[PDB]
């Protein structure tokens, strides 16, 4: 039941991998670079807040989260963009031929994401490959991600609900586990599948950092959207 919900909240929310549009992917490192800075500070402006619109939409096909206080959906969701920004991205990703796609299908190569990204993105490529190198199927994506967003949070109206929610959403991903993979449960892949979230917050935090350098460097004033962001993630 649940899971069939969150399957399909992922696939409406990621781009079919036959639309990827490779027009804008350039592998040769002496072109990959020399663009000024300003269009590659805009270019992963654009990049953040366009994902945010798509996740946002992939939030509201989770059962239950619509039912919770839009004050309760704006602090989840503003909480967890960048891990499921992250997380979508490094799932979809090929970290092997150092290709990154994002949350529309375009698909840009490392080389040319380092001069917006930062080093956050050799650290999101190699989160790729860890993530990738163990090989969850699609229902078990589908729940951690949902996992990442509907979790305890401070300054909740009603934590009960979203607790839940999120009880309800761990206990469908073990029992897909236990089912797929016999009577008998796995419960060392799945705290390894948990412990993928840890990972996930500092790659977060790792780019408010990024945002934050950028902000400082006044080059190409983040916008609004992108201010309110790194405002209301702050967790103090
Ligand atoms: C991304 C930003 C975060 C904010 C929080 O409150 C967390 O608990 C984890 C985060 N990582
Ligand atoms: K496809």
Redo the contacts with the bound molecule.
Sequence with gaps: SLISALVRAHVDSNPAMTSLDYSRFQANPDYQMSGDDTQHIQQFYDLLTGSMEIIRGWAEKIPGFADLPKADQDLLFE?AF??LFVLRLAYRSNPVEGKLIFCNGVVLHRLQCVRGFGEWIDSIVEFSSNLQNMNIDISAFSCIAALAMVTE?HGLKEPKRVEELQNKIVNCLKDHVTFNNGGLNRPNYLSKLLGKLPEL?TL??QG?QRIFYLKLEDLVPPPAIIDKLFLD?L?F
Excluded: G, K, Q
Aim: hydrophobic fraction near 20%; charge should be positive; glycine fraction near 0%.
């Design positions: 909480s960048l891990e949070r917050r977060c935090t408010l993630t967790p």
